[PDB]
Amino acid sequence: DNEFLILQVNDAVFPITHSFGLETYIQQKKVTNKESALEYLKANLSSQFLYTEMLSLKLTYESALQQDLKKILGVEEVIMLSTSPMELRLANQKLGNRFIKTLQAMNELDMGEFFNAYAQKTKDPTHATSYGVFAASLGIELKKALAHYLDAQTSNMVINCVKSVPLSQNDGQKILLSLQSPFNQLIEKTLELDESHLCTASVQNDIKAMQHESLYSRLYMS
Amino acid sequence: KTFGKRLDIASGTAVRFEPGEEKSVELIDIGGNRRIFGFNALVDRQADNESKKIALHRAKERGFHGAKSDDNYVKTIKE
Amino acid sequence: MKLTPKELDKLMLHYAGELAKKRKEKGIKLNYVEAVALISAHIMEEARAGKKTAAELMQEGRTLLKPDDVMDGVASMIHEVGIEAMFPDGTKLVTVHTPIEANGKLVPGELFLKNEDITINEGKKAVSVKVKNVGDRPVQIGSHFHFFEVNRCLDFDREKTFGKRLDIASGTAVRFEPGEEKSVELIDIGGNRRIFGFNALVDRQADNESKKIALHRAKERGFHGAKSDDNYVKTIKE
Amino acid sequence: MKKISRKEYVSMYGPTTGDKVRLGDTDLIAEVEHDYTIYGEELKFGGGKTLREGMSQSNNPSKEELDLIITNALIVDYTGIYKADIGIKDGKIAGIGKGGNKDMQDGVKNNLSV
Amino acid sequence: SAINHALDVADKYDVQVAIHTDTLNEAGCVEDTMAAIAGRTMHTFHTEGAGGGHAPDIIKVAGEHNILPASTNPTIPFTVNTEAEHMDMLMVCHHLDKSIKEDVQFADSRIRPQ
Amino acid sequence: MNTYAQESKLRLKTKIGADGRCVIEDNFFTPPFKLMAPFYPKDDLAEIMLLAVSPGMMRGDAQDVQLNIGPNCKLRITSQSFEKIHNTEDGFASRDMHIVVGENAFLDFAPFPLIPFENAHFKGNTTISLRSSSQLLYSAIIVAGRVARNELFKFNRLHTKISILQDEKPIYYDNTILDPKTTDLNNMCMFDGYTHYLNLVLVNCPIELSGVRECIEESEGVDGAVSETASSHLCVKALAKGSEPLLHLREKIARLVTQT
């Protein structure tokens, strides 16, 4: 059903390489063990994921419910012009393009006239905004869509951390299981956030993302 | 508690404390300019909160009973 | 109409400005005196009118004279025109800075400087000290203040700085903002090296023997970063 | 030691050796022939300047202590066009040269004691 | 040190001492100045601070017995134009050149309409 | 609740003078703002100091700055000292700065670091407008507080919005929000134990990313990085324990830009 299609498109897009600065943290020896990785993940989810991805997802969901294509495009432009790190900007653009292409090609079903028009008129679609507008057009619940997106992104983050630190699958499962309460807290925060906090400037995360370009050997795209 | 104060009795009278005896006395602020000079030379200046610390340190050094000054006392340029 | 000497002076200034204005209307290029008088008289009249504030008058004074209305060199000579004007809320000082744009043709009293830097405190080696302002207010230290005796809210290794002063242009100052940590360069105090005054921590010749006394005094008076031994041996005079 | 730009130095203390100044609006240019000051020890009066108790004003002055000192003046005279501090004492010119405090500065004669 | 010595000599000779305190907090704050005064009669100029670094804490000394506080003309009464002229007056009075970056940066005021 | 008698405004408009120097064509300032004559160093750009006659921004302060640099003006705009945000009890201190740079004009906006005190609430809104040929070197340093006295992230809230438009088209957006109540700014993603944060934007400057990266790497005591924004303009973000390394890095980058 809807959950099956969400899982299918998520698997076809995201698993089918992006570190978002985690590689830089590991190379600079700031993330070493389970507790350090958990602290990094909590901080990243609290600042950058919350104020750049979840907030943008909620804003795009509201704008698509109101059928505000101009508002969606303005939000995308704000995100693009606020994303200072080149690696982060390129990763977001690539993920959004991949999501749009997968929806256009693999999903042989009536996604929606609004979504089709948005895809045909957009220029730099972020992955979070694309998922938000897709959920809004499909009628998915806002809280459920946010929970699913956050869970998928955190699963990718924990598997990347377990591959790169490296950790054990036991530690990966532990950090996946121990983040349930922060997930609910982040969803509750997004439930009361607003557009004024969109793309709140993270400092150390952006610095590490930009230093990822100057890293000696890059095992991750961004 | 008694820095800057005097007994609240008729001027020219005195209060006697017998050895070992404990009494309760009433004290009132010294009037006028409140410049304390003479006595035991513990103040020798205007009576205010800043001179209170110096007076307390002097009294503790000279062994006046009940005078409590902090162990880590910071001296001033003139004291 | 009891007139004060200030009022008589202002009347003279106003009519000097009127003469300058009449000459400007005739088309004579104003000289230094005429330009200053014109600006001052205009400001006084506007203040008497009372429709403008002192800030508005400071802005407006810079628009009275164009560069082509004055002789060559007048704009260079006039740096600022101050005038005490009586507003509806009393007498206020209106200062107009650079009221006329310089043409650049003639600059009276202009300097023709060499293109070579001045080396100050030559032959004196400077040491570097890290200073933190742990107080709540900014602290400015002059070029010749004995750095050992600066505000006790500044935190640094005072032992390193005994007998030294800031290595900056004399008459300038270094500002330490609260909480801010800066690195400063210090050079030995010259001459007889007799430190008198300041915080009365030395009040004598600055040498290694007076250094111990100064450090003990600073520790007693609570100067931050002053480290003196707990078992300090007093001298006969200290 | 430190080097500051000549423009900033001249703005702070006036022209020094080798600097030229136009006299009035005329075409005459006067060059500073020599300077009595010691760079970095110039006398300045103001808020946090050097002419202060213990820095340039001596706390143990000489008995020839000046009544008035003119600091950083460009002396233009038939004896030369140079830069110095003029000390005045008892209605006469007591000394010409580097004035200040002998306790904290070098090259200060007894007749130029501030 | 200067405050202490002047107050000693003035107590010897029965003369008043007036003070215009340190704006830069070079040697200490208002507490250090008051400790130097040491509860002796002192007549204070600009007890409101007049934008000095002792402001606004120097107003605290106006409650002490030994301090006779005075206030200057320009800041009374408080009007619409009071704050506009303060920096120009301060710079000219303290002899800081308005064409010098160092002097302008030095001319820092803590004046407040409050 | 403005404590000043009138609204705090600073309208400045600079143009090229008759003698070829950068002069102040027009200026109107109410307290605590003040403008002096521009300073002209021997070799650098014309310097203008935005004087603030106040110990710092307090509750109810609402400053409105409007700078207008005309064509062919090489201006560096600095401040008198560190901008301190005092304890705003129930209100906040707000600054709204609108800058307009003309054609072929270079503006080096290099204010001193901002130091928020305990329970400080500040709202800054900077809007810079440029032409195609305009060059801008914007900078902003934020301190965690009075670090030397263990006043770390004790302020109420720091909101700073920067909007840079080129040819009336948005090219840079920044929204720095620091709220210690909502989250710990000492975490590994916000400050990671650093106390001073420098954000610098180079628009149309003739400096290479390799040169900026070399400057950042050779700068000591600073964990910094430089990237290219969407509009192909350089953005530098640096962290340091003190403001001295950040100021040195900023002046190094400014010198590298100006020496071209």
* Cβ neighbour number for residue F103 with a 10 Å cutoff: 13
CA C215 – CA C160 distance, rounded (Å)? 11
- φ and ψ at C22, to 5 degrees? -65, -40
Using alpha carbons, select from C195, C190, C189 the residue that is nearest to residue C213.
C195
CB F107 within 8 A of CB F137: yes
Instruction: Look up tokens 């005591």; give the residue.
Output: F221
Interface test with F, best of A210, A213, A215 (most F CBs within 10 A): A210
CA C75 – CA C77 distance, rounded (Å)? 5
CB A142 within 8 A of CB A58: yes
As beta bridge partners, residue F237 has F199, F225
Take residue A193 and report the two structure tokens written for it.
Answer: 């956030």
As beta bridge partners, residue F94 has F62, F123
CA B75 – CA C222 distance, rounded (Å)? 7
CA A25 – CA D86 distance, rounded (Å)? 66
**Beta-strand pair C204-205/C194-195:** antiparallel
CA distance F73 to chain A (A): 27
Resolution for this PDB entry, in angstroms = 2.3
Task: Tell me, yes or no, if F182 comes closer than 8 A to chain E by beta carbon.
Answer: no
Q: Between chains, do D44 and C118 touch, taking CB under 8 Å as contact?
A: no
Q: Measured between alpha carbons, how far apart are the two ends of chain B, in Å?
A: 21
User: Within its chain, how far is the Cα of B48 from the centroid?
Assistant: 11
Take residue F244 and report the two structure tokens written for it.
Answer: 């001295």
Instruction: Look up tokens 């720095």; give the residue.
Output: F176
Instruction: Look up tokens 């509201």; give the residue.
Output: A62
The dihedral built from the CA positions of residue E78, C5, C31 and D32, taken in this order, carries a sign that is negative
CB C206 within 8 A of CB C138: no
Q: Give one DSSP letter per residue of D69-99, joined into a string.
A: EEEEEEEEETTEEEEEEEEEETTEEEEEE--
As beta bridge partners, residue C182 has C131
CA C79 – CA C99 distance, rounded (Å)? 8
Using alpha carbons, select from C235, C226, C101, C76 the residue that is nearest to residue C152.
C226
As beta bridge partners, residue F175 has A200, F161
CA E91 – CA E94 distance, rounded (Å)? 5
Looking at residue F39, what DSSP letter applies? B
Q: Between chains, do E87 and F53 touch, taking CB under 8 Å as contact?
A: yes
As beta bridge partners, residue F47 has F39, F76
Largest alpha-carbon pair distance within chain F? 55
CB F253 within 8 A of CB F200: yes
Q: Which helix or strand (DSSP H or E) is residue A4 part of? A: helix A2-13
Task: Tell me, yes or no, if E92 comes closer than 8 A to chain D by beta carbon.
Answer: no
Please report residues of E whose CB lies closer than 8 A to that of B78: 4, 35-36, 38
Take residue B59 and report the two structure tokens written for it.
Answer: 């009294």
* Cβ neighbour number for residue C144 with a 10 Å cutoff: 28
Cβ-count burial E76-106 (b if 16+ within 10 Å, e if not): eeebbbbbbbbbbebbeebebbbbbbbbbbb
Name the residue in chain F with its Cα closest to that of A82: F173
Take residue C201 and report the two structure tokens written for it.
Answer: 């921590």
E46 is in an annotated binding site: yes
Which residues 6+ apart lie within 8 Å of F250 measured at CB? F110, F139, F141, F198, F200
Take residue A154 and report the two structure tokens written for it.
Answer: 């955190």
CB E89 within 8 A of CB C93: yes
Using alpha carbons, select from A203, A40, A161 the residue that is nearest to residue F188.
A40
* Cβ neighbour number for residue C159 with a 10 Å cutoff: 16
Instruction: Look up tokens 């975490």; give the residue.
Output: F187
- φ and ψ at A156, to 5 degrees? -60, -40
The dihedral built from the CA positions of residue A44, A47, A51 and A55, taken in this order, carries a sign that is positive
Using a 10 angstrom Cβ sphere, with 0-12 exposed, 13-18 middle and 19 or more buried, the burial of residue A176 is: middle
CA F33 – CA C111 distance, rounded (Å)? 32
Q: Which amino acid is at A217?
A: S
Instruction: Using alpha carbons, list the distances in angstroms from residue D80 to C20, C39, D35.
Output: 40, 40, 11
CB C31 within 8 A of CB C74: yes
SS3 F193: coil
Length of chain B: 79
CA distance F65 to chain D (A): 29
Q: What is the CA radius of gyration of chain B?
A: 14
CA F67 – CA F13 distance, rounded (Å)? 6
Please report residues of E whose CB lies closer than 8 A to that of D53: 2
CA A151 – CA C125 distance, rounded (Å)? 62
Cβ-count burial E42-54 (b if 16+ within 10 Å, e if not): bebebbbbbbbbb
Enumerate residues 46 to 75 of chain B having a beta carbon within 8 A of any beta carbon in chain C. 74-75
CA F210 – CA E72 distance, rounded (Å)? 59
Q: Which helix or strand (DSSP H or E) is residue D9 part of? A: helix D6-13
Enumerate residues 19 to 38 of chain E having a beta carbon within 8 A of any beta carbon in chain B. 31-32, 34-36, 38
CA F49 – CA C97 distance, rounded (Å)? 14
CA E8 – CA C203 distance, rounded (Å)? 17
Length of chain A: 222
CA F231 – CA C114 distance, rounded (Å)? 45
Opening angle at CA D97, ends D93 and D102, nearest 5: 105
Using a 10 angstrom Cβ sphere, with 0-12 exposed, 13-18 middle and 19 or more buried, the burial of residue C19 is: middle
Q: Which helix or strand (DSSP H or E) is residue F56 part of? A: none
Q: In what order do the strands lie in the sheet with E42-44?
A: E18-19, E42-44, E67-69
E86 is in an annotated binding site: no
CA F134 – CA F102 distance, rounded (Å)? 6
CA D69 – CA D112 distance, rounded (Å)? 8
CA F148 – CA C180 distance, rounded (Å)? 6
Q: Which helix or strand (DSSP H or E) is residue B72 part of? A: none
Q: Give one DSSP letter per residue of chain C, joined into a string.
A: ----HHHHHHHHHHHHHHHHHHHHHHTPPB-HHHHHHHHHHHHHHHHHHTSS-HHHHHHHGGGS--GGGB-TTHHHH--EEEEEEEETTEEEEEEEES-S---SS--TT-EE--S--EEESTT-PPEEEEEEE-SSS-EEEETTS-GGGS-TTEES-HHHHTTEEE-S-TT-EEEE-TT-EEEEEEEE--TT-EE-STTSS--EE-SHHHHHHHHHHHHHHT-TT----SSPPP-S--
**Beta-strand pair C90-97/C80-87:** antiparallel
CA F178 – CA A47 distance, rounded (Å)? 11
Q: Measured between alpha carbons, how far apart are the two ends of chain C, in Å?
A: 68
Instruction: Using alpha carbons, list the distances in angstroms from residue A57 to A62, A150, C2.
Output: 9, 11, 78
- φ and ψ at F47, to 5 degrees? -100, 130
SS3 F74: strand
SS3 F51: strand
Task: Tell me, yes or no, if D46 comes closer than 8 A to chain C by beta carbon.
Answer: yes
Cβ-count burial D84-95 (b if 16+ within 10 Å, e if not): bbbbebeeeebb
* Cβ neighbour number for residue F21 with a 10 Å cutoff: 15
Task: Tell me, yes or no, if E82 comes closer than 8 A to chain F by beta carbon.
Answer: yes
* Cβ neighbour number for residue E112 with a 10 Å cutoff: 21
CB C177 within 8 A of CB C135: no
Instruction: Look up tokens 């004003």; give the residue.
Output: D57
**Beta-strand pair D80-89/D68-77:** antiparallel
Q: Which amino acid is at D18?
A: G
Kindly tell me the number of DSSP H helices and DSSP E strands found in chain A.
Answer: 12, 0
Q: Which amino acid is at C10?
A: K
Instruction: Using alpha carbons, list the distances in angstroms from residue C230 to A123, B62, B72, C218.
Output: 73, 22, 13, 13
Q: Measured between alpha carbons, how far apart are the two ends of chain E, in Å?
A: 32
List the determination method: cryo-EM
Name the residue in chain D with its Cα closest to that of E23: D47
CA D106 – CA D56 distance, rounded (Å)? 11
Nearest-10 Cα torsion for D24, D27, D28, D29: 90
CA D4 – CA D42 distance, rounded (Å)? 14
For residue D15, whether the previous peptide bond is cis, meaning omega lies within 30 degrees of 0, is no
SS3 F211: helix
SS3 D35: strand
CA F54 – CA F237 distance, rounded (Å)? 29
As beta bridge partners, residue F26 has F13
E strand intervals along B1-79: 5-7, 27-29, 35-36, 45-46
CA F136 – CA F105 distance, rounded (Å)? 8
Instruction: Using alpha carbons, list the distances in angstroms from residue A32 to A18, A25, A36, A164, E59.
Output: 19, 9, 6, 10, 56
Using alpha carbons, select from E18, E24, E19, E69 the residue that is nearest to residue E47.
E69
Instruction: Look up tokens 């107009």; give the residue.
Output: C96
SS3 F186: coil
Helix axes A113-121, A127-138, angle to 10 degrees: 160
Q: Which amino acid is at E37?
A: I
Task: Tell me, yes or no, if E57 comes closer than 8 A to chain B by beta carbon.
Answer: no
CA F233 – CA A82 distance, rounded (Å)? 12
Tell me whether chains A and F touch (3+ CB pairs under 8 A). Answer: yes
Q: What is the CA radius of gyration of chain C?
A: 28
Q: Catalytic residue at E94? A: yes
For residue F111, whether the previous peptide bond is cis, meaning omega lies within 30 degrees of 0, is no
CA C165 – CA C186 distance, rounded (Å)? 5
Using alpha carbons, select from B4, B54, B64 the residue that is nearest to residue B32.
B4
As beta bridge partners, residue C183 has C130
Neighbours of chain A (3+ CB pairs under 8 A): F
Take residue D104 and report the two structure tokens written for it.
Answer: 């904290």
Q: Give one DSSP letter per residue of chain E, joined into a string.
A: -HHHHHHHHHHHHT---EE---SS-SS--HHHHHHHHTS--EEES-TT-TT-TTTTGGGGGGGSSSEEE---STTSS--TTTTTSHHHHHHHHHT--TT-HHHHHH--------
Instruction: Using alpha carbons, list the distances in angstroms from residue F17 to C39, F25, F154.
Output: 20, 8, 47
Instruction: Look up tokens 């209060």; give the residue.
Output: B15
